[model samples]
Target: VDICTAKPRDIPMNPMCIYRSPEKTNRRVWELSKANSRFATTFYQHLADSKNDNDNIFLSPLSISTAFAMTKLGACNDTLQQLMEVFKFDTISEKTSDQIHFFFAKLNCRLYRKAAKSSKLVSANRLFGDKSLTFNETYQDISELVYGAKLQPLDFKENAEQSRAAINKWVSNKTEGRITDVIPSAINELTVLVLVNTIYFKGLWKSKFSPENTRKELFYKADGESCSASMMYQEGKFRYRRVAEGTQVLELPFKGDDITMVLILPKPEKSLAKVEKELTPEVLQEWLDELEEMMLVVHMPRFRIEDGFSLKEQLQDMGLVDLFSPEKSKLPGIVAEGRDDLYVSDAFHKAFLEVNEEGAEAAASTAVVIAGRSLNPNRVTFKANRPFLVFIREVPLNTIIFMGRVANPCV
Candidate 1:
């Protein structure tokens, strides 16, 4: 069944699948799209720039935003200002104080129904707070209804190990065991609250990628060297587009037809560094908009990557300054007393994505700890043999679910 050896006589091919997000004049979801993409593109730029040339990047901005949005309900003054600025949600708050949360409420409900509408897809948020402190009643009520988050009282003061294990357990289940030990450390006496968000998605290819076609091949790294990678090869008439500067975009459909993986293969000589710098919502949209069906021979690596990053510094660098400092932190919304000394202590995020013949299973978890925290192809023989950017998008609403760079897939 070797793909190279196997021959294909004209076999039946189904009509190509292309998804376009529905037009909606509602400003809330539009705001959600704007804010979410701002975080995704900018945060990814930070991670990509900060990482070692060969270290891979994988994360979920949606999870981080959801966790922070839950806490955003209780923020006020400068603390509120910083959150809105960092999250790019200032536009959504133009109407009323509670307006942004209302948008999140609608957004979360839509995502829930969509997840339940298809294959295994789950995204969850929770607040693990110290039992001693009483949360603001209004904040509690809104978080539950809007973000679908429940505040679970934990005894961090009495037993740190017990509480840490419990937090890990919840994350384990939410991501279906894809993530564990979410908050492995810093569960000591001073800990008061922890906010956690996890997303899990399992998808199957609409077209067949027979397992036998997968074979170990040499995948070149950013450097001239190469590493052994299990490459999965497929041929299909996929929606493809080529942007300026030798960057080509290719779209691959999953089983649901509502989501697709947008692969961005940069120009060989310029590689990922140059193309990535120009990555923005507008540029990405342009590439997606002009895609037309074309035949292609795809050789994508079968790789599983997991990365855990402490997000305190990056979030701060992204203008989320007040969240981590005890003095500058303003989380009165969580505590009924509106305490001044409260702020996020630490934040952690980890993501897992595996690509094989059947499809891809991506799971990522963002634990804020009160703190904060592609494309394309064609029949042009697109070989992802070098460093490339990849992202999974909910095509109907045009949402970015997961994103990363395969700098060295073998890692």
Candidate 2:
């Protein structure tokens, strides 16, 4: 395990800046990442529990968190507290908003830049408000300065369809068309604002699978049935670990090595459900700590995952109930004169993931409609012939950009 140490780069400091040591900064971001991971695992399990056993689950916790964090700019009182609690922001004594903004900028700097020309990672955030409603200038400025998001005004009252189309168009463009129809339907006149965050990533594997070796292979489903899949094959030295409980974890690095896709495969006797039932940040850390570099043959199915979720109910199920309550919602800072008329109507999330012989491409869009409210590895054989989990993450920051399970490749 040769970990290359790189020189430090400049971090953007705004008014929310807290003078903290680099270690403290990294520690804060790491803690935030873990909390988000916990939320992601919970949300995924919720989806899995409700859907068919063989259905795929894909999401971007980072994107959703960014959207919620942006909406928090307008939140106050219990609404803010609920969000903070759900994100585990209470654990940190420092200002949560400041840390989120700082780390987001830091992560963007580390991941979106300096990668090979063939690799691409882009994340975009924006605030869209109803033209009829008046938003506080302070809120807009802070969002722009701290989160790198600009507020865009739209006439949801006059042109709901047009506004929805415009928002979806922005998301589609940002995601390189990987995510489309992100807003689904038109936003009605009651919709006051929409906060959106989107991220796109494309990378070539450090040791790419040979397309020539890819061919039809039998993929076992959750019910023991088999489906023919185009399985890609590659052999190389990779970071591998055989974790506790019949699971194997492998780290597959992308070109330039700043980011990696971690795959977790459960043995035939076990199911993805079993591994997911006990998945946690600490367990993932243990896997990373125990990974050993070894030469191994890899067989993985070429898969595509395009999934969408309406998270209002799911978030409420997770105890974030205040944001959706029109009466209980408090977003005084977002509107002029500290009014309490704002509430989140819904939260929408759509994610796309594709893995082939070359590498992987993924994108996700999360929108808090302000009518709105909001908000493995290793490898041994690592043959992902059955159900498995996948994560595309920025290794340096430990930030998960995209995560999902591949139940069936053809789906």
Candidate 3:
């Protein structure tokens, strides 16, 4: 069982065993994927629209969705409808709350506990509310029982700074210190509730690239900046295919094989913009469905990305404004006492990713703060030397854990 010492001749290699989750959970995964796909596409465009085209972009749509879904449990009336519409929750299930919780529980069971020891995956959720605020028992019960989230009392009214520090500390611990200061510096007494979600993953490549095989190579950026990046090389039998869109799709499995890193690289003749422009849920689904097995020589850069965003403006621009507006928002389910004056003040997200010889390590956190109202939310063996799309997918549920682009690996 010592992989490093085992010889190929002595140990017969076999195809990876995929976990077969129940049909319900599997279907829910797809439903969530479709919803997330729309948001991912839109969110990426928002990043692009900022015209920080040179910057690396990383996001955990699942983490964001989970955190918002927890908040959604507290929404009612038009506020709930708007939130559902924005998240595309209505399309997934009538009982969206229960389904979201069920999906996460099933996903955690298969990917977190059942996966190999070489791979480490953690999803942690925490709720911090003002000591004086009385949260609804139903919300607390479902959050605790289904999402494994627990409510903790924070003295936001009397000690906003201390409460903020406590929330950041919890996030830092959950993400193994990859993400700190997630709650930011501007918390105040009105921040009665903060719901946070964190996901961390460290996995070894099934076919690892040797350190000696990595070398400095020229990477062509979309902005015409030529930089030398540490590119890791590995030749292996992998799931890959050349798509009609002139892109390559490659599936790189991790140690457990229950999760995979998928890369999509545009041809040298084309720009990453072309790939991004054409990317849609249908296109992505087709590419994944068409991936075929072949021998691939991968040249991927060893890169790290840590990015953060305050999604208040972005979500509003996407037509989810009501939740943040005090007068229009309705979240009676969040607290036992009815207070129509509650509204969300801020929504923050931070994500980190590192790719090296061993494999990839990633962590992300999403926080939604409510005064009362609130919230919301590759590859064919292609050389990813230049800018490209990347996704870490949990294979059993077919849920995407992380997705982003490494526009400038050096960044």
Candidate 4:
């Protein structure tokens, strides 16, 4: 039940400066994470309505901005149109297949509204942020955090590494040993700043799902329709646990591992509906406590799905309207001119998730662009077919890096 550390009593000053993205990126990301957790905690809400709930929902900071752009361009604007512009232009750079394939991409764009006064670039010999390694020359690795109107370039590649390292540190500290390396170095990308975080787990049902009992089953459609499905059968130990708020269900994986899939079926049948609303801290706490041991006939589907979403519409549906509009968002940090003319160019999120007998694997990618004097930004396409999980990211400012994983090569 002890998972992530509790949130601080008071909201701390945003950590954007630490990694240098935008002003409120910290708070907005926090909110988005809470929203994502809502669905994850409730086993993906609105599945029947969207019909794509079983898949992963990927979002990077860039996609977050793209969502903002959608609202500003027009409630009727097509996200594809904006993406054409971003890919057509050379705004983003330095990317690889796995980086784009395995992690969720959330794009966001912010303008400072005003450019910084004459500034002194960091000397190359200095260490930009938390990176212990020293820089060789006038390091452009870290860009100045401009207050407004000027699009100060950033070292997205380095920042991606920094972001991953930070997240890895948190994971190591939080798990107390279970997750030693959450972020791999194979992730690479090109953009202003690339940030990707994901949870990969492999657990066997606390009890075993007898292969002899496995059979072809039918999965229902939203309209109470049905499709052929492969369901695993098991009869053994179960987590018959409960918290004050709801009932619990666990799909013990193949082996006797604590990493089995845990489901918190809500008190009301329509739990995902409430999940779409606002998720409270107390509710999350209660759900965590509800997981217990019990005997169950686990009938779970063996499924794998890959999907790409141009989330210009989803963010709007989530109630973050001002960010994408050139006229509304406080994005002076992204560009030199933060007027109506300087709005978010595009935003989108692509993700992939698959669950097998061994474990689960997932990846995602996202990007954004600002209309200005940059370069011919070529669009990089990430293709997934092999069995690898990689995370790549780049910052529009200057640098790019890559990270990857294979679970266990021996397996």
Candidate 5:
């Protein structure tokens, strides 16, 4: 089917199909969502400032859920919130994030793939919230899909090192090489919970020009300043197309089997700011509808970027305001009460991605083509040649797992 002729709604309209799919049961949705949200957001924050952009991160929600299998208190929404608080707090220091994520994952061993909930289940008769749904795997998954993870108490110090190793390996793998060293042994015992993430991406022009065709290009900043840049080169038939008004749009796919990069380039005379001011979710959907397949020549720069971000100013910038409040929302299941002084102590993310004809392997040719589209208008275009919002999501779930923009990927 011609991509430009399709609507965003036309491509797999059912968002939760993955959750319903056989490999991952409905029971895992909530676990996936809760983990995805906390980990993805935090990881992206770290990558925003990291030096490598080719690596990626992944987190297992079951790790955290396993802690609750042994005992069930009210560790539902409140526990998840406590984690968010620690992550959001900047002054608390970085060691807390690593140790905390490790502590919780080990505590929840029952939820891991090969592991089963211990025979010593929590006393169902005494648990808080919904008893029927809490124990039921499917029900718990559904709850997590909408709300988040259930938090429970476990002796964190008992298995601190194991947790650290798990988180460390996960981080190393996700960032590719950009984030090389993650020492879980570096964490102290005071750490209670942790949320870690790894994100990866590789961007290219919709029409890839040949390497020999590379040129020393003048890159423009948001402020309109220009500098020398080694822009990648590629030319071919692609989904990207120019609008009647002179705007340009392109699509770039990543490794693995999911996602596409929808690049919206404004006309030369217009800046990204003007186009962003007029852009809306509704319009973006519409633009996705108009994209079509066309043969064309193009040039794109090959670049890599990675960084660790402190999410304080960024969260407020993105409208996640309440999480940072002083009195903050309560995290009942995580710790004792009157301790409701939950606040995000730190938030960080790291990611990496590299694009090659045969992705990291001699046999690999090109990344899978999932979906692509473009939009152009008479107004200015949004050229994200520098730093802009980058998002990673599992479409079937309508879940926006990772979102961060590299204003400067080279940083």
Candidate 6:
């Protein structure tokens, strides 16, 4: 909450400066945090609807948000509205869009710097625009300031393949090789801009599961089938609660108290849908408050999930239309000239979340190419041996770094 206290924000602003003065109403920060939280759960439910009930869904909403926020700086008219609607920024307190952009920068800086020392949390972003099109200085300045992404000129018109490879390489490097070749061969002559964002988090548990305690266990799937899993076992005091819906809630803090991974595991007897429908922002906030510290016995899988897919259809299905169409998109804010030629063609997102004896390692990369186009009680036993929801979050900011559903641990 205190922006100017013991520390400087995060990185120094080159073209993009960090707005550290808390002079502007501090409630703006909290408002943005709440809206981001609201967007996370809302988008999660929508994402679930697109996948099979039993299919795996993994991603970093923050990664996607930060990336879009970069693009949003350049958007105008309906394109901005569509983005704001999907972002749920209508819930934000600040009436001015510029103020919201400043809030995002502070959030991004504070989160990354806080985790940089404790959890190896990193979120990196870059914008590659066609060299022919000149960028608006104001848009470029804010993109760097708020999101730490500078518009790098690339020869997308003359060298589309090399441009694609270059963008992929940036994503690959930022994600620590967890996500490679994310951009694909989509870059073409008409491609005007490529906005990319990556978030990587590797944190040790506050109390880690001993590798020696790991054993072969069976993980249940929604299809009434069981699969083998490397189940890790640990017994200790944890924040836990049991809701009336027959779902168990558990919070596992990672090393520092700043970041935590919460588990939402429904009893194998209850259908996942029953619990999912109640995943509103209000209910989730209440559920988190219900968790009380108690002794617990935990059994969770040491699993690896690699999820990569196109979010273009999913986002359009969720009411984001103008961004993908070159003609319909109004992204004049991005360029000093030829503003209308640029529109985001498609979005490619790839995420890798791995849980092991030490802790959780999660990294996600999202690329938008412009074509021109919990639980438990004391003494309670928790076995996450079935399909469940996982969230890695930054506590102070209430920022969700990574979210996913683990239907089958092996896959």
TM-score each candidate. 0.85, 0.85, 0.83, 0.40, 0.49, 0.86
lDDT of 6 at 235: 76
Candidate lDDT values, in order: 0.72, 0.72, 0.70, 0.30, 0.37, 0.75
Candidate 4 residue-wise lDDT, 75-128, digit = tens = 212232332222211121332211111112221111111232221111000011
**How do the residues 1-411 of candidate 2 rate in per-residue lDDT, one tens digit apiece?**
100121122222233322221222223346667667766666666777777768888888778887787777667678877787776555444544445555555445565555456668776667677775666666665566445677788888787888889988988998888888778763788787676666777877877776668789889999878889999887678999878877889899988787788999988888788787787776777687687998777888888888886678888988888888878888765563444577776777787877876776622222222242211244347788988988887777877788888888854
Q: What would the per-residue lDDT of candidate 6 be over residues 133-162, giving only the tens digit for each residue?
A: 677776765666667677888886786898
Which scores higher on TM-score, 5 or 6? 6
**Candidate 5 or 2, higher lDDT:** 2
Judging by lDDT against the true structure, name the best candidate. 6
Q: How many collisions per candidate?
A: 14, 14, 12, 94, 70, 9
Ranking by TM-score: 6, 1, 2, 3, 5, 4
Q: For candidate 4, what is the total of clashing residue pairs?
A: 94
Q: How many angstroms is residue 12 displaced in model 2 relative to the true structure, after the best TM-score fit? A: 14
lDDT by residue (14-63, candidate 3, tens digit) is: 12211112223113345666676667666676666675657788878777
Looking at model 3, report the run of 10 residues with the lowest lDDT sum: 12-21
Candidate 1 lDDT over 207-244, as tens digits, reads 64666677888888887888888887777688888779
Better of 2 and 4 by lDDT: 2
User: Can you tell me which runs of candidate 1 are displaced by over 4 Å?
Assistant: 1-29, 91-97, 114-118, 336-340, 362-378
Q: Give the better candidate number (1 or 5) by TM-score.
A: 1
Report model 4's TM-score to 2 decimal places: 0.40
Error of 4 at 31 (Å): 11
